[PDB]
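Predict structure. Input: Cell growth regulating nucleolar protein LYAR, 79 residues.
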Amino acid sequence: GSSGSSGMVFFTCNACGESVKKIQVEKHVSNCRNCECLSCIDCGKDFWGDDYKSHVKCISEGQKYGGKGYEAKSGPSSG
Ligand SMILES: [Zn+2]
Ligand SMILES: [Zn+2]
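Output follows.
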């Protein structure tokens, strides 16, 4: 990313499939009017609707521990 230095929260548009940053979201949405949910690759979390907003950092998240359980991921939208 053409920026002074690296170190920001990135996201993955589940609408088309592009690497959209936190601040980029605003811009992206402009073109992509199909962005419903977003995911953070930095740590790995799902943010439906306007949830990603709250997500400002990836610290204090016990994600590493766990994960295992079931391979299958795809499922009913209603989660
Ligand atoms: Zn998109
Ligand atoms: Zn994150």
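Residues 13, 15-16, 18, 28, 32, 35 surround zinc ion (ligand 1) (CB under 6 Å).
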